[PDB]
């Protein structure tokens, strides 16, 4: 049960309670205004308290995708868009300048509201901002942030071999080949995103999808099951053994492991050409 | 330099080399057809080899967002859409049924092509499928997958306190409150996605955004800097000290830590009402 302001690119949702001059609270990393509700109850006799879900969070919703460049660490799109969200909200609720308080990364949003839309600001408070750009030791803090983001990436890719080895239940050499970190930072970033997408959206949905043995028997003349010569004892071979046992569909052993088509391409090709050539 | 077939919801990209009957390779968890290129070079005298980037991967691109329900573990949207992608590709390249080989989760795509579009299949090969739905011990494997996906979530949230503590450089009690895992599985899933979004798209972009001290001095009469009484020694307070030292803008100490507005809402409110009431 939240209020809505439709803006360019998003439906902005906010809580509103109180009477009196408008006071907008801008949240930090939690992104949502509900964290200000106990404070709003303390203030509602004196201010019209407005607590925002910033457009990428909570009950707010984007109506257009973020630009490709938003993932660039030097992108200014989001912080600028967040600031003009607050300015538009302030103008939709008040014909006079308003009170604004932002905390943590939300106090950085507040700084940009004052920089680019001073006309909407009556008074403003910056609660514990973590901005470093104007500090004498800016580089220390900026480098540390860039390193922590990269640290989380490396720690993610380290779980690759459990991710594929324990879900596909394949041989460790195959699991290793599948989870081997890419050669470059950009390649590793893409690799991590692929792995996380596959985990969320592919492995469970596909491996429990609606296929039955009677679906194979109906066209058994078209089907060959393939087991790698190097991946014996693995779960996917056990699947093919079950299909072969119950339907009579043949298994052909083909060189290599779970990735035999890239591990041993000449031998893989020879077997296929004998099957189908 | 990849071929393109525009379909409903995506631009499907594929590699094509060879002469002769069409043979479509469907990739597994890597999602991209380049993994079949060394094999394609072995086969190109005998088949027209077609190696696909499935629509969510690689050089393929969605032109509409995935449905909300695609994240449901029992969703069939993606595997069905992948299969009709292959069927449409086969019909765009050949007036006769074609050869198809899928590996790993791509062999599950292949099963669905045969189930729903048998007319496009001349022969088909399932290379080491990890499907469990028709196995007698299906539940063991299905439960194990669901548990591994949930394991990766728990392992992610465990890095929350380093994520906020080492980027904001705040007190450990505050970092703990920010990273405390939500009460429910759905709450924890959303929490992890928020944290990963903030890391990628917020922390670096906002903390090094283009604000200078001269931006504060221009409207210094409107600004109050707020430091929590419980977060002394933290980096965000050091930021406010620098601003106060160089601009003269006042600091008000307000009850609580980095999250004082929810930690101590009555005391926080009292200070604000004295500032602004």
Q: Show residues of chain A in contact with B135, CB under 8 Å.
A: 239, 242
Distance CA A110, CA A89 (A): 13
Number of H helices, E strands in chain A: 12, 9
Q: In whole angstroms, how far apart are CA B124 and each of A171, A226, B101?
A: 25, 10, 6
Please report the domains of chain A, with CATH numbers, ordered by start residue. Answer: 3-127 (3.40.50.1820), 138-207 (no CATH), 213-276 (no CATH)
CB of A192 less than 8 A from some CB of B: no
Which chain B residue lies closest to A73 (C-alpha atoms)?
A: B205
Query: Would the CB atoms of A56 and B168 count as touching at under 8 Å?
Result: no
Q: Which long-range contacts (CB under 8 A, 24 or more apart) does B31-34 make?
A: B31/A194, B31/A198, B31/B56, B31/B57, B31/B58, B32/B57, B32/B58, B32/B59, B33/B58, B34/B58
CB of A153 less than 8 A from some CB of B: no
Separation in Å, CA of A271 to nearest CA in chain B: 11
Which chain B residue lies closest to A110 (C-alpha atoms)?
A: B223
Distance CA B209, CA A132 (A): 8
CB of B207 less than 8 A from some CB of A: yes
CB of B141 less than 8 A from some CB of A: yes
DSSP E strands, chain B = 3-7, 10-18, 22-26, 48-53, 61-62, 98-103, 121-127, 223-228, 251-254
Query: Would the CB atoms of A203 and B145 count as touching at under 8 Å?
Result: yes
Distance CA B144, CA B142 (A): 5
Query: Would the CB atoms of A149 and B201 count as touching at under 8 Å?
Result: no
Distance CA A250, CA A38 (A): 67
H helix runs in B166-234, sequence order: 172-179, 185-198, 204-207, 213-217
Q: Which among A41, A128, A268 has the least Cβ separation from residue B258? A: A128
Q: In 3-state terms, what secondary structure has residue A36?
A: helix
Q: Which among B42, B104, B216 has the least Cβ separation from residue A269? A: B42
Q: Phi/psi class of residue B57: alpha, beta or left (left: φ > 0; alpha: ψ in -120 to 50)? A: beta
Separation in Å, CA of A21 to nearest CA in chain B: 10
Separation in Å, CA of B80 to nearest CA in chain A: 10
List the structure tokens of B147: 């548990």
Question: Which residues on adjacent β-strands are paired with residue B6?
Answer: B11
Q: Which long-range contacts (CB under 8 A, 24 or more apart) does A249-252 make?
A: A249/A216, A249/A220, A249/A223, A249/A224, A249/A225, A250/A224, A250/A225, A251/A224, A251/A225, A251/A226, A251/A227, A252/A224, A252/A225, A252/A226, A252/A227, A252/B125
List the structure tokens of A37: 């509700």
Closest to B159 in 3D by CA, of B185, B187, B191, B184: B191
List the structure tokens of B163: 């994520």
Distance CA A145, CA B204 (A): 6
For the beta carbon of residue B136, count every other beta carbon within 10 angstroms.
Answer: 8
Separation in Å, CA of A64 to nearest CA in chain B: 10
Q: Which among B219, B239, B262 has the least Cβ separation from residue A114? A: B219
Residue listed under structure tokens 């989760």 = B105
Q: Show residues of chain B in contact with A142, CB under 8 Å.
A: 204, 207-208
List the structure tokens of A60: 């707010």
CB of B31 less than 8 A from some CB of A: yes
Exposure letters A250-274 (e unless 16+ CB within 10 A, then b): eeeebbbbbbbbbbbbebbbebbee
Distance CA A216, CA A219 (A): 6
| First and final C-alpha spacing in chain B | 65
Backbone angles phi, psi at A48, to 5 degrees: -80, 100
Backbone angles phi, psi at B192, to 5 degrees: -60, -40
Query: Would the CB atoms of A114 and B215 count as touching at under 8 Å?
Result: yes
Distance CA B44, CA B16 (A): 9
Distance CA B223, CA A100 (A): 10
Return residues 1-20 of A near B (CB < 8 Å).
Answer: none
Query: Which residues have C-beta within 8 Å of that of residue B214, sequence separation ≥ 6?
Result: none
Question: Which residues on adjacent β-strands are paired with residue B145?
Answer: none
**CB-based contact A31:A54 (threshold 8 Å):** yes
Separation in Å, CA of A2 to nearest CA in chain B: 19
How crowded is the C-beta side of B110, counted as CA atoms within 13 Å?
Answer: 34
List the structure tokens of A198: 């596959």
Distance CA A228, CA B204 (A): 46
Q: In 3-state terms, what secondary structure has residue B228?
A: strand
Q: Show residues of chain B in contact with A205, CB under 8 Å.
A: 70, 72-76, 78-79
List the structure tokens of B137: 């011990």
Residue A74's Cα: distance from chain center in Å? 19
Q: Of all helices (H) and strands (E), which one includes residue B107?
A: helix B105-116
List the structure tokens of B73: 């573990």
Q: Is A114 exposed, middle or buried (0-12, 13-18, 19+ CB in 10 A)?
A: buried
CB of A99 less than 8 A from some CB of B: yes
Query: Would the CB atoms of B78 and A194 count as touching at under 8 Å?
Result: no
**CB-based contact A110:A89 (threshold 8 Å):** no
List the structure tokens of A257: 């492991």
Q: Of all helices (H) and strands (E), which one includes residue A49?
A: strand A48-53
Q: Which among A111, A201, A266 has the least Cβ separation from residue B70? A: A201
Separation in Å, CA of B5 to nearest CA in chain A: 22
**CB-based contact B158:B179 (threshold 8 Å):** no
């Amino acid at each position: 049960g939240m209020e809505t302001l439709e803006l360019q690119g998003a439906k902005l949702r906010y809580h509103q309670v109180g009477q009196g001059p408008v006071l907008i609270f801008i949240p930090g990393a939690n992104g949502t205004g509900d964290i200000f509700l106990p404070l709003a109850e303390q203030l509602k006799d004196h201010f019209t308290v407005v607590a925002v879900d910033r457009r990428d969070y909570g009950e707010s919703e984007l109506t257009e995708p973020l630009p490709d460049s938003a993932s660039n660490p030097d992108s200014d799109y989001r912080v600028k868009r967040d600031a003009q969200d607050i300015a538009e909200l302030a103008k939709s609720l008040s014909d006079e300048p308003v009170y604004i308080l932002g905390s943590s990364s939300g106090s950085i949003v507040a700084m940009h509201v004052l920089k680019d839309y001073p006309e909407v600001v009556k008074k403003i408070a910056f609660h514990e901002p973590p901005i470093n750009t104007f500090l004498p030791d800016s580089t220390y803090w900026k480098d540390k942030n860039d390193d922590i983001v990269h640290q989380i990436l490396t720690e993610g890719l380290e779980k690759g071999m459990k991710t594929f080895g324990e879900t596909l239940n394949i041989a460790p050499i195959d699991a290793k080949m599948m989870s081997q970190p890419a050669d470059t930072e950009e390649g590793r970033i893409e690799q991590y995103k692929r792995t996380m997408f596959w985990l969320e959206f592919e492995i469970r949905q596909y491996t429990h999808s609606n296929i039955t043995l009677d679906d194979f028997t109906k066209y058994s003349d078209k089907i060959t099951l393939l087991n790698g010569t190097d991946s014996r004892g693995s779960f996917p071979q056990d699947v093919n053994f079950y299909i072969n046992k119950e339907t009579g569909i043949p298994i052909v052993d083909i060189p290599g492991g779970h990735l035999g088509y890239i591990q041993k391409p000449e031998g893989f090709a020879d077997v296929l050409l004998n099957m189908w050539g």
